[model samples]
Target: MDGGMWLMQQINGQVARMKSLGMQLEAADIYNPNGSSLKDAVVMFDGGCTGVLVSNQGLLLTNHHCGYDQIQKHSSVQHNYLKDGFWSYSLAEELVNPGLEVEIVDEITDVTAAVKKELERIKKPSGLEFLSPRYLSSLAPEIVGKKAASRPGYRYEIKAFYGGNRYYMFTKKVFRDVRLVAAPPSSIGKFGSDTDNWAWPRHTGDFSIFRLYADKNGNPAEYSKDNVPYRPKRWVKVNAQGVKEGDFALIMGYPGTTYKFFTADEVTEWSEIDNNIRIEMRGILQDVMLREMLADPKINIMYAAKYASSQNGYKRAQGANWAIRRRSLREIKLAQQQEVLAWAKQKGIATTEEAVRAISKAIEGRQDLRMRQRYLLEGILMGIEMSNAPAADSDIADHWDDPARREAGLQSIRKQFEAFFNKDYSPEVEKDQLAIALLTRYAERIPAEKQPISIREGIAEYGSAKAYVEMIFDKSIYASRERFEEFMKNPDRDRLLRDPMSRFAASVAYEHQKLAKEVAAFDAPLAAAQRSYVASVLDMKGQPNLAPDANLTLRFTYGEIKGYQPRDVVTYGAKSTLEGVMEKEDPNNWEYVVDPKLKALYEAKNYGRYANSDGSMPVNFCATTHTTGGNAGSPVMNARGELIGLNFDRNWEGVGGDIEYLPNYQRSIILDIRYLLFIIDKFAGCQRLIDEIQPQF
Candidate 1:
């Protein structure tokens, strides 16, 4: 498979190629260190997705799904922001969200020398154990402290690349005071919902606006009414002229993770075992959630975000499995493995041969434990109620002996308990879920010997899984906020420990830890083997374009506005128009239902200046830009580095692109900038926001 372009190493070369294709900018225009550039405007939206600073006063733009939790937090029956859109015509109307923040890349420096220098000086294990969190944490402070002393007010991180073969330190400016600026109703923002989530030819608006606030001196500060709009160092210029077929496009964002370097056996294991387990486990939980959500509207609102998150993985798991088989990904990896192993043998490489053989044995021997771990993690450990348990010995636990301190501790623990139950939590829903998940999905896979004690004992005691779950929900003080408060006031450690839910949680945690220890013991040799294998590939194949796998680091991928023939006769267009949005409308379904005002605008052909010369308005578009989960809300720019669209999802057929990128099938789906402006100006009538943004069309 042909891979996408790497960002840092070939910055100049990539920029020149883009310029030759159509770019009006230079390499420095994208990654300038001394002056403001596009990189300055791009940010890590809440650490999971990308966000662009569009206005000098720090008006941020990201995907609707990226800011979904923040929007859901402010939604309620009295004023449902999810049902009805929210537009902040004034700054005072913008909602403040606690714990929401954005981080920008201040600078990136290659410090492989210092890192390697330290590594050589220190005594450690023979392989990748030195790259583990424990070892790295001990070394990072000194490495970061030296650089941070010169670069004040910035957080530094050293990320390993090429399977711990290389390292680079990234300094970032994190903004804490972020506020929700505006968002369209779910009809527009989440137009097709799950049905249209990863599919192409999509017309979902999928955009949201937020603003960054800072102290008077323009430094990052905590959320406060006193904070004012932050003056950003740089911002993106929206290109309303729009994109056409074959136009050059660039996408830069934090792509979460990719296993583009895994072995054939690893690919087969992930597709067959891991993906199927997630689908099976989440499918059961989703069914239980959907039933409860349909029965109660309050419950529906509370579970909307949670359910959507679950459904995303469920669909992705199914899609990845299908794609893996359809594309013959395992065959490709197996071929590569044969070639790499042959080369190592010809070179008489003892270390490489041993590493390869050891990895294969480790994978073969640990299948049972791995299978049990999956069931334990997805079923028992991830149960909604017990998963939300408070820390075992929290900060409040420290002052439990003193009367005055104990009162303060009680208040803190009460606050924690309140936060846990702040939503419309239904124990009945969780009880049913726990019963089905444990009995049907989890217990069926895990042997009785390997199952948690709670699972074994509870089923035996009550004679059935459902009855056991019911007993826990009914008797546990943790099930009810009032009962929890009462118990906390009098605080008896033994009684708390004996609570059914607590005991169940302890059993699950214990089993998980036990299995994890076993896995780690096996993984040590496997990780070392994998590292050597990767190193061998680089050494054997003198291909310069072979970059490291994604690890949530900032990366740039460039391609063109292109479409693909996924099948023998089917073809997808590079761009989708507003006509498709109107044609796909279904009043009975919320996913297809459009806002009356939006429908009226479409009916009257009132797209204004946002309409293309063809008298059609662009909605969503597809490109060859390589991206993944954290690339959501990433700025999709033209050759001139002008914002044209926002990256949100990958095509459903290419879900396996995470492990193996298929250039013929993989495509990044984006919401056109013109459609975003239409919603902001026409549908929401937030003209003040329009005036704030300076489009470079």
Candidate 2:
């Protein structure tokens, strides 16, 4: 999935409509190499599990720790698998996590048939009586003019798969009441640390085990202590002996989103300007934040994940942008654009002045839209503090600790405060870090014109949090927290941003808000043009419903498992072996640890699947599958449906694979199942896990 907000909105709509029908949506499923379906399966939600009926009763399986975060909120150093992990045996032995639930989509179909005739009657899409606007206009007063809920016959969604080559009619069943059944400790489950996050040659075991529950009759039921584990229609058989290279693989998961549907101009703008700013912004914050974290171990714990996430996203975005910018896609699009423009000219519908005016409009767009860009990087920093400190405390001492729910303690701090304070806790430094974070966020999102001229303008405007504090608190212009409170209590303050802290935060928040507006503005006209382009090209050239890869939907792209040379005299094979891991191991680095047991396997040359692959051996691999953000957790399945690897991240060179995949740069990286299992057994002393999977090997 693209992970875009717009895409999320659309998916939410589809899920809602599906549930209105009679079909049930399953979150998890297991497939055999021969495409055989076996065992009960459940999909993991934030905390619980949902059933996928493979059989009659509701039997299910899902990630274990999906139940961890919300279940055990305040564990101390002694028992922290949120840092460590957990495993369960019997139902009673299984942990009952708190606030966990499951979501089910009931049913969906081309209800378009139901509304097709009605749709034909309306000149405007939204103006149709079958739509929400017309049907609920009377109830608008009660709903405050917001979107009306779907009625029996009003909503629909388009389902596309196999890269828009296949279609399906879907309806879903929504359910709740999921519980935890099994989970491993953090060490075994999340083996590698930040150093290995979203990275290949991954040693992390990122799976969780959970179970779904329902009423005795197998119907959706509310949470209850007496409720039994839901009996799913079917469940997946655990594969024991895993896959080898050249073996088939498949992934079945709810991939979140992607932006494969961007126009050339849009993609180019994102690639060249927006992406460049983002990269630059991250570089600035990362450099400063890394120093602060290194200087304080207390901060390191809290900052570790933040840094990792930032670095991961930064690298990911850069890689994708670079891939898009470096490819021949621009040339192809420009050629297409010329062809379209030529048609416009030949049609005598467009004059030279009109054409020039349109081009000018595009340039003007760059200006207004860029404001959001220029402010983005810097603004994010200020917003960070607001997010970090959800609840306010009277004293700074209690600021990091949990306050009474009524007291407004920073919600995030409650979870991560320990890690944050584990390092040298410096208030001044923390505030300063906040400032820098905001500053960078501002720079990234604001346009070039609105930008404070340069970094110098930023420094001059708000040198540091200390300076910012003085500006906001001591000075009447910004107002102190109390002063602002006094002003707001009586409607005295002009606006929230009138205060200094508010003003600074505005610089950070406003930039991104503007970005959404900019993107939306371009969406209409650009979408119209792109739709025409696709219709005239891909669809006309092919057939109906031949949609371009957009909306970050799950589209399957097929290709042989292969490798390429990344550099001269150095070839990258399709596979990466344990030999490579050992060869590249830097003993000094903590990540390079050779588990005592794994070392024994290495010494014994106990290569199981390796020996089976090409007779040359491989422990990991690269692939030509087309994937995006939502596709990360997708299983790389073979024709036979056996999983070859777990898609986690993309190679640095493959970010722009969405537009036109460059074979040299576009390999989706996955954690070889063999490697995962090997680490599970040899490294983590979890042979029981290996015994659990029913693999063909």
Candidate 3:
């Protein structure tokens, strides 16, 4: 869940609580240092998501969006995998994804002693010293150099947990030759799309398949035709028996960060600063993208991933803020903080007052700096294409003067520019985006005084942001392919380098880093104080009362599979069925389009053996298990560690659970294993995947 840790003591009580929840397995059954266990079956999907080994032949299961980029990378009009879906009957047909990695964890070591010992030597260095990711990341190499050097293909990561009081070192075996084996079409994979993103009664088939390839001895290696499937130490049974409403659902995966220990002060900052700024700025960006996307299908194709990504983030912030306001999460946090503060004062703990003051000071002091940071991030960098619009002719200066070399340079630049504008980019659309972003950032979000010097000067010289943006679109080399090509005909080094787009992008970067440093100065006292506060809290409540916040490390949390009432009159069922897909289908809407073959199977009732107790074709289910961002595609397993489903989402009401566990509102949205196999065997007609995953009920 969002709040569970994996230590085996009351600190270790994670395992016992899971056992008490009817988990019919030992600690070693879930994770065994001596040998194979469920731990060996779970792997970290690239981009910090989760994937699980479903077969000993290295068949990996993860979410569709988790592998969406890889899928998009290989897709083309000739072989439209995203629309038609993809399945590899033979191993060679499986698409190779270069640089994609799935890391199998080797060991997790408690380096708290080592980290604290080193920190004791540093003695509270200034400006977020040990609490910074930059500084803490460096410690892993220095402290674990010997332990890491003992093994090959070993990657070490040291991360602080529980508000910076504890650190853990993860030794990972990274496999690079991962390949896409199968995936459902977006019509199925991303069914309901944005319209139904975080809602319940979800019918989306949100899973994808990949395979890990290894060298001759099953060691992790680069891709080669000679490589074979990775025969993992263990793989979970694909239990098609399915889960019941109150059955134990044990999930083990790398969940991303949470702030369960946030004081009331920190909670207020999150609501007003992070969530509000994100929602406001992303709206300006998303609106422009959506306008163009709706008008032109090509732009939709070009900007589909980016728009959805932005929308997903924006929607999460909105939901989190909504719940924060509605549920009075800040009040809850304030009450919790006050109780701890009072207890500490009563017990003669003098440092709590000082820690609370430091936390207050940091939160209040960093507001404007943080706002400036977000403006650059969400507005200029993400909103405008010009921020990173590439200079294809970077080496033009070397050949710009000589006719023969200049022709060659121009030729290379033209080809690179074609790859840009001719593919995935639109000139007019970029103009629109840039116009809105500049106007929003300069005229609205950021003040003239705090705006980057270049920005202020540029706007002042042109009269306004709109006027300056107009000049950029009219005169900047990056405005269009024709404009750029004409500019290159007689490009001047200074003039080309000093183009409005390039200078603004440069200035934006300079300002971002400037704010980054200033914000870190503000972060220092807060980080140190939070560390002390948590340490004191632990001393008071003891480990039994609190678990460490997640830090994208492996963890184990268990809960019963159940549904809840989202509103007073609406009691949702635990599971959704293929029937729900039909109910939601609309021929005109792309998201609700059911694949013909899937529809055919549904009509024929050709579910094979993959059906629920009442003869329904199960699609997704709900559970009380806590999960967050990185838990996507994590294995939702049965009591004995048999695979039940893949964890894909959470209810919108549950978004605030990152700060406080909402026992009644939060639910982990999971994709049923039966639907996964049904798609493979009945829908896609790829019995090979079913055959490979055949060692199950």
- Among these predictions, the greatest TM-score belongs to 1
Higher-lDDT candidate of 1 and 2: 1
Model 3 alpha-carbon miss at residue 627, Å? 0.4
Q: How close is candidate 1 to the true structure, as a TM-score?
A: 0.94
Tens digits of per-residue lDDT for model 1, 308-376: 888888898898888888998888878887888899889887677677677778888778888888877
Could you estimate the TM-score for every candidate? 0.94, 0.66, 0.92
Give the CA lDDT, 0 to 100, for residue 351 in model 1.
71
lDDT score for residue 275 of model 1: 85
* Model 2 poorest 10 in a row by lDDT: 1-10
User: Residue 420 of model 1: what lDDT?
Assistant: 55
The Cα error of candidate 2 at residue 264, in Å, is: 3.0
Ordered by TM-score, highest first, the candidates read 1, 3, 2
Per-residue alpha-carbon lDDT of candidate 2 for residues 1-697, written as tens digits (9 for 90 to 100): 1112212113323333323421133212232222323211324254122222222333333322233343244233465444445544456655555456544333323333433343455675432233233442333223322342343212223344322232333322334565544444544344444455444544444444455666666665666677776665444433435443444333444444444444456566666665666676666667777787667545554454456556656676667665665666666555655665566566564443243344335544765565354435434542244322212223323332334542333333233334323332344444556555655455445433564332324346776434644444344322224443454344321332133443444444454565655655544433334444443344323443232453323233334456665556966556666665556455455445444554567668775553544443345566765555545444555544445455655565566665555666566666566665555455555444455443456
Each model's total of backbone clashes? 0, 121, 4
